[PDB]
Amino acid sequence: ERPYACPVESCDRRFSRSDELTRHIRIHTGQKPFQCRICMRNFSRSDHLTTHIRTHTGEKPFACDICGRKFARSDERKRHTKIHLR
DNA sequence: AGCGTGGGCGT
DNA sequence: TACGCCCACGC
Ligand SMILES: [Zn+2]
Ligand SMILES: [Zn+2]
Ligand SMILES: [Zn+2]
Structure with a gap:
């Protein structure tokens, strides 16, 4: 079940875990708490x-x-390994 | 190819 | 709750 709405x-998203909802809310708040020390871009x-x-x-x-x-x-490695197939 | 970024979850 | 794997979608 997804009790966490x-x-x-505008949003009808639901979640199994409360922390997943808290992460999701950042999309709406624009909160990007993690900054690259090299180029200053936020994530x-x-x-x-x-x-x-x-x-x-x-x-x-x-x-x-x-x-x-x-x-x-x-995931990049994963996508690559398959090229070695037939 | 390079790589942003959400989806789901184990710890 | 955070941290950080995998997984996945989408340029
Ligand atoms: Zn939402
Ligand atoms: Zn950077
Ligand atoms: Zn290879």
């Missing part, structure tokens, strides 16, 4: 800040098992 008028989410920072540093923690090519994000 968004109280903003809604701390995890998205971390991956953004890799655009500046070149850090690529995730290597393809088949070919060893490195990526900044796990």
